[PDB]
Amino acid sequence: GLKAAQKTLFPLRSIDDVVRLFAAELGREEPDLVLLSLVLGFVEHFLAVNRVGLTYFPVADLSIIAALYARFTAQIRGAVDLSLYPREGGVSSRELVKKVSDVIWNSLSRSYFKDRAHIQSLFSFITGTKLDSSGVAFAVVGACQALGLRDVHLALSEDHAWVVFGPNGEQTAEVTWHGKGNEDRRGQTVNAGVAERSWLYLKGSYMRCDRKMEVAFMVCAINPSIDLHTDSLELLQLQQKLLWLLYDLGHLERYPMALGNLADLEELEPTPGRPDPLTLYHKGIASAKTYYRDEHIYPYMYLAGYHCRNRNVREALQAWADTATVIQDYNYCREDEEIYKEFFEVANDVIPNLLKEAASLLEAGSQGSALQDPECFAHLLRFYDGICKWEEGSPTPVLHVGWATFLVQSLGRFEGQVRQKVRIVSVPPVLTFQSEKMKGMKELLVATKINSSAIKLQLTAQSQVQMK
Numbered sequence: 001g002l003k004a005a006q007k008t009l010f011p012l013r014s015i016d017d018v019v020r021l022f023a024a025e026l027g028r029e030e031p032d033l034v035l036l037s038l039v040l041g042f043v044e045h046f047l048a049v050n051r052v053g054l055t056y057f058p059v060a061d062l063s064i065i066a067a068l069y070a071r072f073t074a075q076i077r078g079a080v081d082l083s084l085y086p087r088e089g090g091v092s093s094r095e096l097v098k099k100v101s102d103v104i105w106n107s108l109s110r111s112y113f114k115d116r117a118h119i120q121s122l123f124s125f126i127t128g129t130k131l132d133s134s135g136v137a138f139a140v141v142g143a144c145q146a147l148g149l150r151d152v153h154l155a156l157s158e159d160h161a162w163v164v165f166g167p168n169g170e171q172t173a174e175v176t177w178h179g180k181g182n183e184d185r186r187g188q189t190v191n192a193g194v195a196e197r198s199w200l201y202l203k204g205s206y207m208r209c210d211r212k213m214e215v216a217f218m219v220c221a222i223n224p225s226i227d228l229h230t231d232s233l234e235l236l237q238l239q240q241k242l243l244w245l246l247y248d249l250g251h252l253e254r255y256p257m258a259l260g261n262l263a264d265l266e267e268l269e270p271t272p273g274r275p276d277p278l279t280l281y282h283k284g285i286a287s288a289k290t291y292y293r294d295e296h297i298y299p300y301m302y303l304a305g306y307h308c309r310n311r312n313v314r315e316a317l318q319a320w321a322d323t324a325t326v327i328q329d330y331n332y333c334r335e336d337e338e339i340y341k342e343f344f345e346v347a348n349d350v351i352p353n354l355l356k357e358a359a360s361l362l363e364a365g366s367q368g369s370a371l372q373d374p375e376c377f378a379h380l381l382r383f384y385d386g387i388c389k390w391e392e393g394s395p396t397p398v399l400h401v402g403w404a405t406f407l408v409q410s411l412g413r414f415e416g417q418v419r420q421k422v423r424i425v426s427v428p429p430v431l432t433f434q435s436e437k438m439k440g441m442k443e444l445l446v447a448t449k450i451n452s453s454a455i456k457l458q459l460t461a462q463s464q465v466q467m468k
Ligand SMILES: Cc1c(CN2CCC(Nc3ncnc4sc(CC(F)(F)F)cc34)CC2)ccc2c1cc(C#N)n2CCN1CCN(C(=O)CF)CC1
Pocket: 134, 156, 157, 158, 159, 160, 161, 217, 220, 257, 258, 260, 261, 298, 301, 302, 304, 305, 306, 307, 308, 309, 342, 345, 346, 350
């Protein structure tokens, strides 16, 4: 190709030219993933990587993009034995997916930063031979679409990516790395990570993308950051309009995190006549409830972060309680460290910041501060209960005295006569605990005075106090 089902369109000199290109591709039953990713990376390269690049908007000539397009396809088609990896039923094999994975893997530069920005698109792969972890997986999918394998698709969790294929559409295969120095099982199924109930594989409730959702992923993969303090407004606008395009077409229906991304963008710059950010946050959560058994963490974190920024403490605490209620039915494993850092920061930094803020107006007698709402205390309890339950059954522990220090300080923010309003009932503001650490603690939580040493011993599985 390109056989040129789409070849007005060019060149592209505005944000809206990129949108119409995507609108044309999303009407073909196979939207050209390689073409669209190349355009995105090109535009992002001259708006975020190099800017002197250009001032207004980078003009993408078809001659340029087609030259990069043909070098990617000529590579892929030059290195893999498509007929020898045949069409045993019209679907791909593990040997063919592994071979294509092998081709991308052996093309990357031996030395670079696996976490740099702006190395996620096929533009990065074709010009600098560098990709991040999830970019390698997407490059495999796009390479397979280039070969004609309409059964190879992108699988996504909240921190990892791989490929689904084979008999519609069960077969999974690792195609990229995850984390630093965790041995690579490329070609293997993900069913060991599903069986161990690690958050990295969402207990099997991971996203299985069609070609439209794969287009949505590369849109979310746009990084508008030019450095550490400034974003490219132009790139923020394009991601916003592209997500709103996928939105209206119905292609974010099964993409909870994409609705969070657009809601975050709407908060920065509202689009006239579009739903308010809160609407979209609830749409992402409802998407996770409907299609993935409500086992995703980020739909609620998206909402919790919005409520935290706007100082809706009760709604923020309830959204974090929901994150804990989801996390509680997983086992904490190595590879799950990214979600550990999120829970660690919320419990030991964000929530203490919010409660201390609410503690100050307690002496400034203005009641109505969230520290007098027993609902807020119930959500904080459900939050720690879900993390405790998360820890049980795990190969490695979660909680420690650093966790214990801020739990005690947080409980202490609530007056005793507010804490005592929460009804903790054992099955079999009303709350039910599921972790054994919190159940044994319930009387200590609603005491007139908070016994700091006792609760710390309860939470950290410590057995003994200092001898002296
Ligand atoms: C929205 C958000 C983010 C943003 N992230 C951006 C990247 C998103 N991923 C994805 N998004 C779309 N598709 C994919 S596919 C994939 C797997 C891969 F393909 F890549 F393998 C990942 C992924 C997930 C959400 C990070 C931490 C956050 C929150 C929200 C909270 C909360 N609460 N947190 C916790 C840390 N703090 C943040 C700032 N914060 C506040 O502003 C105060 F409210 C306090 C909390």
